[PDB]
Design a protein around this ligand. Structure first.
Ligand SMILES: [Mg+2]
Ligand SMILES: [Mg+2]
Ligand SMILES: [Mg+2]
Ligand SMILES: [Mg+2]
Ligand SMILES: [Mg+2]
Ligand SMILES: [Mg+2]
Ligand SMILES: [Mg+2]
Ligand SMILES: [Mg+2]
Ligand SMILES: [Mg+2]
Ligand SMILES: [Mg+2]
Ligand SMILES: [Mg+2]
Ligand SMILES: [Mg+2]
Ligand SMILES: [Mg+2]
Ligand SMILES: [Mg+2]
Ligand SMILES: [Mg+2]
Lengths: 173, 38, 207, 141, 59
RNA sequence: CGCUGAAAGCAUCUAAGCGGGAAACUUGCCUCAAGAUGAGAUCUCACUGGGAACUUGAUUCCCCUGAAGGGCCGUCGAAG
RNA sequence: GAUGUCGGCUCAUCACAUCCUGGGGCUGAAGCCGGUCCCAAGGGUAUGGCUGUUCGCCAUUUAAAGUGGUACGCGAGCUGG
RNA sequence: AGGGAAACAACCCAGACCGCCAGCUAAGGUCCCAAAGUUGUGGUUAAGUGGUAAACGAUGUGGGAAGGCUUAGACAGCUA
């Protein structure tokens, strides 16, 4: 079926400052989420939310599914904390987070000091584990990918920063 | 990548995608099945 | 900003260690400020600068009145420097006090003009033979272009003429010594132009 | 014999054009038509009889399709390999006024009358023009 | 030149040259281009009186 | 190389959107450059007398005046 | 009722189907090295023995000693092997 | 000869006795260079196709008639 037909069924604490063109979601555990949706849309106000297009084109049918999922991600962001579990594999690799500074040791001559953006705060329960907490899935994934890009995994040893996806390439020769 | 004139699937995991006007082929199992143009 | 002086020949100084430092001595008269071009009235921001010793019979009345707004009693030439942000009054004095040891600078000035130079001297071309049957052409340029379909000579072709006194700048020369008493700058390296000329000294932006 | 306009007895007016989303070509053709003077009964090809045109927004102009990231503007400097190019998106941020001028320049005669007609075009990238004394009248509302 | 002048004179009144000639040919006004371009410039009232009748011809 | 994301309840680097990205591109370093007839911009200096005919941006002519400065000429230049 | 033909020297300009440098994918790529294929023309891209030779084989390097067009560039610029 | 195909003895229209600052048409055109429709109605195409090009490859998109299962519970996904 089409995801645009399913409702959002927002949880208890949510505010919808909908100005028609610009939607905004406010709640506990992070707030100030807002998105300017495409013009060709219909948004109702009720205990749940439903999305429908006006022109039955090949574009708006996809825009409705995209915006429904974006609003669902915004609702989940202020109800559940997004996370990305990145694990370090390799001897001599460690991560030492100092507040808003995430310094990594990846075998380079100089220590990389990756500066996190506003909102996202990372925690390191171990030397080979990162927990990137945030409110927006897009920004959390972008920060996780940017941290990953310093040293991507290697198939012959697995020696590189990697996340929970266990489909890593493996070959030995 | 593998530049060709006829991109096609090679295993069950190959999915053909038209990315930015180019018919790409991405394989989740075998990186050798990745094909760029065709 | 920068400082306008005179090239006065090269010299050499010896440090205690033993190495020789080739030096170009630059005489700097104390420079007066003639204008302060603000942004609101001129667009860009710059400051005029002038050296002294020009006789009253050689300055026009327009220039005499121009040097009367600020009590300068100015002399030969007027130079202008573009600056980022620094206030200067109508009447000020710019000396060599803004320079220190190290402090790589850019030195401009009109180079020594060769009258009318050939291609071997201007563009470092290679000459033809001298004995193996060669005709009169020994140092003349050879071909110019291709046979049928350039249809012409391409613009920018390297040909002979006027290795001139056009402005040229040597980049990032380090200052060896600054004399606030004799008003001299010792620059490590060469300076364009002949001795007794005019030279502009500015901080190096290339670093 | 038929009547011909005289440059010493010609009437010219001032107009102001607001380009705030207008298509580049469909605006340039109207500007060129009114500059050459095809909107007057007393039109002559040999002498110029047209109205001054003022453009107040040379950066809000619109081009349809994928030509924002395309439509290179080529020109040669004269030196060998001196060919240079710049696209619509990069040129409209650098020099907004020359984007719309080149369209009208290519839509006038290539005679010295075309240069005279082009001098009556005065484009501006801001929102106001320094011709308040002339008091141009709004058109194409 | 006469066609261009007549078109310019007609567009100020609210018609086009192609429709103006058709409106004239629905009736038989039979005025040549030489003496329509002369009326377009000088006798603007007469040209307007021709154009309104061409509109009244509904063509 | 990607993140969110449907069309096609999953997946999906794209259709909307958000990133990283090489001596190439555009600045940044140097020189010429308002004949850029679109001829740009700041400072300063110089000129404050009459008469006639004919027509009236009013034009032409007679006398007196010639300033700011520029040129001529001469002594020359590591400029030619 | 005339467009001077091969090589050499001087002078270069243009295409990328790229030899080096630059950014990347796959690899039967442990590392050091490599093979293959996209993007990239900004700058570089050898001296000699032989032979009239371009080409080619040699000895010795270099990061590399690129492929073509330009009357198989260039004799109102030089030689006549 | 003339008009059109941007210019193009051989292609399309058409065969100049001369004069006109007269009108209607053919090929070919009617946004500006350039004379004439930003004319009216029903659709398709987003790549500058139009404005060069084959084998071959591709859930690009519009239309047409047949099919296989299905509220007795299909197709996806979630748990054994
Ligand atoms: Mg891309
Ligand atoms: Mg000299
Ligand atoms: Mg000799
Ligand atoms: Mg020759
Ligand atoms: Mg030619
Ligand atoms: Mg011409
Ligand atoms: Mg000026
Ligand atoms: Mg005087
Ligand atoms: Mg002859
Ligand atoms: Mg290539
Ligand atoms: Mg560069
Ligand atoms: Mg030859
Ligand atoms: Mg000779
Ligand atoms: Mg007709
Ligand atoms: Mg026309």
């Amino acid at each position: 079926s089409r995801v645009a037909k399913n409702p959002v069924k927002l949880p208890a604490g949510v505010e919808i400052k909908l100005a028609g063109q610009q939607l905004s979601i406010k709640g506990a555990k992070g707030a100030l989420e807002l998105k300017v949706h495409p013009s060709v849309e219909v948004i109702q106000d009720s205990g749940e939310l439903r999305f429908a297009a006006r022109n039955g084109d090949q574009q708006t049918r996809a825009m409705a599914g995209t915006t429904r999922a974006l609003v669902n991600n915004m609702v989940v962001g202020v109800s559940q904390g997004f996370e990305r579990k990145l694990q370090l594999v390799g001897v001599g690799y460690k991560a030492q987070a100092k507040g808003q500074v995430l310094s990594l040791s990846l075998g380079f001559s100089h220590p990389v000091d990756y500066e996190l953006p506003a909102g996202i705060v990372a925690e390191t329960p171990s030397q080979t584990d990162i927990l990137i907490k945030g409110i927006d899935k897009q920004l959390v994934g972008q920060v996780a990918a940017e941290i990953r890009d310093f040293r991507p995994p290697e198939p012959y040893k697995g020696k590189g920063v990697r996340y929970a996806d266990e489909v890593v390439r493996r070959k030995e020769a | 990548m593998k530049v060709r004139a006829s991109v096609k699937k090679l295993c069950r995991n190959c999915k053909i995608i038209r990315r930015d006007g180019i018919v790409r082929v991405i394989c989740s199992a075998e990186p050798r099945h990745k094909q760029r143009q065709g | 900003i920068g400082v306008v002086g005179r090239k006065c020949g090269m010299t050499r100084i010896f440090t205690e260690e033993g190495v020789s430092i080739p030096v170009t001595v630059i005489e700097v008269e104390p420079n007066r400020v003639t204008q302060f071009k603000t942004e609101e009235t001129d667009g860009y921001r710059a400051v005029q600068v002038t050296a002294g010793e020009r006789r009253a019979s050689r300055v026009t009345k327009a220039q005499a009145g121009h040097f009367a707004k600020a009590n300068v009693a100015a002399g030969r030439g007027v130079w202008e420097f573009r600056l980022g942000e620094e206030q200067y009054a109508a009447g000020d004095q710019i000396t060599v006090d803004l320079f220190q040891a190290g402090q790589m600078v850019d030195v401009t000035g009109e180079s020594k003009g060769k009258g009318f130079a050939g291609t071997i001297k201007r563009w470092n071309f290679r000459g033809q033979d001298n004995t193996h049957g060669n005709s009169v052409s020994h140092r003349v340029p050879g071909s110019i272009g291709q046979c049928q379909t350039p249809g012409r000579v391409f613009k920018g072709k390297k040909m002979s003429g006027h290795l001139g006194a056009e402005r040229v700048t040597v980049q990032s020369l380090e200052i060896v010594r600054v004399d606030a008493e004799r008003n001299l700058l010792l620059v490590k390296g060469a300076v364009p132009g002949a001795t007794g000329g005019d030279v502009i000294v500015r901080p190096a932006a290339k670093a | 014999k038929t009547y011909t306009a005289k440059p010493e007895t010609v009437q010219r007016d001032w107009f102001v054009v607001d380009a705030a989303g207008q298509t580049l070509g469909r605006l340039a053709t109207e500007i060129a038509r009114r500059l050459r003077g095809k909107h007057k009964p007393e039109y002559t090809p040999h002498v110029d009889t047209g109205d001054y045109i003022v453009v107040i927004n040379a950066e809000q102009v619109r081009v349809t399709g994928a030509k924002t990231t395309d439509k290179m503007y080529y020109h040669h400097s004269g030196f060998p390999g001196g060919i240079k190019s710049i696209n619509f998106e990069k040129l409209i941020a650098k020099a907004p006024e020359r984007v719309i001028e080149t369209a009208v320049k290519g839509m006038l005669p290539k005679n010295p009358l075309g240069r005279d007609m082009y001098r009556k075009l005065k484009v501006y990238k801001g929102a106001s023009h320094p011709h308040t004394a002339q008091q141009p009248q709004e058109l194409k509302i | 030149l006469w066609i261009a002048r007549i078109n310019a004179g007609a567009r100020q009144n609210g018609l086009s040259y192609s429709r103006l000639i058709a409106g004239l040919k629905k009736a038989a006004i039979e005025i040549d281009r030489k003496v329509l371009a002369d009326l377009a410039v000088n006798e603007k009232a007469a040209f307007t009186a021709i154009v309104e009748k061409a509109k009244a011809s509904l063509a």
